[PDB]
A paper describes a structure:
To understand what caused the activity difference between the mPARG E748N/Q and E749N/Q mutants, we solved the crystal structures of these mPARG mutants. Interestingly, while E748N and E749N mutants were completely dead, both E748Q and E749Q mutants still retained residual PARG activities. PARG E748Q and E749Q mutants have very similar conformation in the active site, consistent with the fact that glutamine has the similar size of side chain with glutamate. To study the enzymatic mechanism of mPARG, we tried to soak the catalytic residue Glu748, Glu749 mutants E748N, E748Q, E749N and E749Q with the iso-ADPr, which may be the smallest PARG substrate containing the α(1→2) ribose-ribose glycosidic bond to be cleaved by PARG. In all above four PARG mutant crystal structures, we were not able to observe the electron density for iso-ADPr at the “active” site of mPARG. For the E748Q and E749Q mutants, this may result from the partial catalytic activities of these mutations and/or the low affinity between PARG and iso-ADPr. Surprisingly, we repeatedly observed electron densities, in an unexpected position, which fit well with the chemical structure of iso-ADPr and refined well when iso-ADPr was built into the densities. In these structures, iso-ADPr sits at the secondary binding site which is far away from the cleft. This secondary binding site is at the mouse PARG exon 5 coded region, and is not formed due to crystal packing as it is far away from any PARG region involved in crystal packing. There are four residues (R478, D480, F491 and T493) directly interacting with iso-ADPr.
Reversal of PARylation is predominantly carried out by poly(ADP-ribose) glycohydrolase (PARG) in nucleus and cytosol, whereas ADP-ribosylhydrolase 3 (ARH3) may play a role in mitochondrial PAR degradation. PARG comprises an N-terminal regulatory/targeting domain and a C-terminal catalytic domain. The mouse PARG catalytic domain has a bean-shaped structure, with the active site in a deep cleft in the middle on the abdominal side.
Residue numbers in the entry: 442 to 515, 524 to 956
The structure:
């Protein structure tokens, strides 16, 4: 029978914290916003905010905070005071939460449906679970939500396109912001015809409450698990959000870098078995995809189980082709089973990972968006091969960091299935990109054992015949020109891997 894994033994791959560089002291710079007191940062203690007291910026370079005094509502009065007054009330029934949220969202009183929240509260939860929800969890969420100005004292810059910039933030700060998103308090993030934020993903959680989909109660469970944890016990770690945008990329056709090591397996998960490795989030260019709406596929799932990722939607503009988002220090709060319609919340997860010197859990996630291919052959066009290579490379490269201090890339079938990607091409693309970035690859095929074998066989062949990135890229070009360009059927008669074997063996 087929084996469970092939290639380099996974324990020989590099992983954090062991492989990590010595971190320099944490400090703010022009490229790094730090919202906590670094001199007061201690293990197991909730970080203190810097500055000591709330400072406001209401402009096109920073998040528009709900607690801003320039956040106004019909005389024009303080919307924050109206938020406070509406949410500092007792909820016994789901309509009470709905009505509270709608007091400072009156324009959406008709357009925001709450059927899934009502159903969740009254049909899915048992009586005692609901009491707990409205007697403990919801008041505790309101509490940290209204402390926003005491917790998030420093303005948060928007990570716009082209910026190479980092925001480091406490998990406690993220909790207060995510509580605010739940209660839908973020201004200028709601309208269809919104201008300033149309290039940003949704942050407010309103669409989690709408419609009759069975996906919603599973999403709400997942999120209330998170809110329960961080209100019962305040998290003490930091998380770093980094936008990375590269203008220059390898000259793929002539790249002389050799292929790196591979571990490929049809069992295991990226988040479970890629511990301490760069974990690829198969993202939407709007990071988190439809996580706060109806989406529940590869683009959303990691944002649910590591819900601190969701906060990135507050300040991360849509990714361009040459961009990615790197998140360090998020915690896994939930386990799940299934996918899409079969997604279900299994149980809470106790993340047991170590922390680095900046008190960030040794978990690194990179969101990179593949293209969607609505015509299958489009992805073999060299220009599209290059686009994916460059996207993956941007996700993997760490300017300034020696390669020996880089963990393996933990990845899988990026943008395949219903998104249109070919698994075997995308595997080879990620292998080539990892080679250029001088990282090893741990590839999870999620049940597909023939694919595990085919990937390994190809990697072994190319490695043994000493084909560098450029030679392999040249074979991709030959495959395009000889089999794809003039192909009048949806797929070509000869496949990619068989073409490569034959071309090398004929040559
Ligand atoms: N994230 C940060 N951003 C900016 N400054 C910071 C940060 N973290 C610490 N500091 C500052 O770096 C200093 C430690 O520097 P050393 O490790 O080299 O010794 C800290 O004192 C911090 O100074 C400021 O925070 C204080 C706020 O106090 P009140 O305004 O409520 O009175 C105040 O002193 C102010 O100047």
């Amino acid at each position: 029978p087929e084996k469970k894994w092939l290639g380099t033994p996974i324990e020989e791959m590099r992983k954090m914290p062991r492989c990590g560089i010595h971190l320099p002291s944490l400090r703010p710079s022009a490229s790094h916003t730090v919202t906590v007191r670094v001199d007061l940062l201690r293990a197991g203690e909730v970080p203190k905010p810097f500055p000591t007291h709330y400072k406001d910026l209401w402009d096109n370079k920073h998040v528009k905070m709900p607690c801003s005094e320039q956040n106004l509502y019909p005389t024009a009065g303080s919307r924050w005071e109206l938020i406070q007054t509406a949410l500092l009330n007792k909820f016994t029934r789901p309509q009470n939460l709905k009505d509270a949220i709608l007091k400072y969202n009156v324009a959406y009183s008709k357009k925001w449906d709450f059927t899934a929240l009502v159903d969740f509260w009254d049909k899915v939860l048992e009586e005692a679970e609901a009491q707990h929800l409205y007697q403990s969890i919801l008041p505790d969420m309101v509490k940290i939500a209204l402390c926003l100005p005491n917790i998030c004292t420093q303005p948060i810059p928007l990570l716009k396109q082209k910026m190479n910039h980092s925001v480091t933030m406490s998990q406690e700060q993220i909790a207060s912001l995510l509580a605010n998103a739940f209660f839908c308090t973020f201004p200028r993030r709601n309208a269809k015809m919104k201008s300033e934020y149309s290039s940003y993903p949704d942050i407010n959680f309103n669409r989690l409450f709408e419609g009759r989909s069975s996906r919603k109660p599973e999403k709400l469970k997942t999120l209330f698990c998170y809110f329960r944890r961080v209100t019962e016990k305040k998290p003490t770690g930091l998380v770093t959000f980094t936008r990375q945008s590269l203008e220059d990329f390898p000259e793929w056709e002539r790249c002389e870098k050799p292929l790196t090591r591979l571990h490929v397996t049809y069992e295991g998960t990226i988040e479970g078995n890629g511990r301490g490795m760069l974990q690829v989030d198969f993202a939407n260019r709007f990071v988190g995809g439809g996580v706060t709406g109806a989406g529940l596929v590869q683009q959303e799932i990691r944002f649910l189980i590591n819900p601190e990722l969701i906060v990135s939607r507050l300040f991360t503009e849509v990714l361009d082709h040459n961009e990615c988002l790197i998140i360090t220090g998020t915690e896994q709060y939930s386990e799940y089973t299934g996918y899409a319609e079969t997604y279900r919340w299994a149980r809470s997860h106790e993340d047991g990972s170590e922390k680095d010197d900046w008190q960030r859990r040794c978990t690194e996630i990179v969101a990179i968006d593949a293209l969607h291919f609505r015509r299958y052959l489009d992805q073999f066009v060299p220009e599209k091969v290059r686009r994916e290579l460059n996207k993956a490379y941007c996700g993997f490269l760490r300017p300034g960091v020696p390669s020996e201090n880089l963990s393996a890339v933990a990845t899988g079938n990026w943008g395949c299935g219903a998104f249109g990607g070919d698994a075997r091409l995308k595997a080879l693309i990620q292998i080539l990109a990892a080679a250029a970035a001088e990282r090893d690859v741990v590839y999870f095929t999620f049940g597909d054992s023939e694919l595990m074998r085919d990937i390994y066989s190809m990697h072994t062949f190319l490695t043994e015949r000493k084909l560098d990135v450029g030679k392999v890229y040249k074979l991709l070009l030959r495959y395009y020109n000889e089999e794809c360009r003039n192909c009048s059927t949806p797929g070509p008669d000869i496949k990619l891997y068989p073409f490569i074997y034959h071309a090398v063996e004929s040559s």
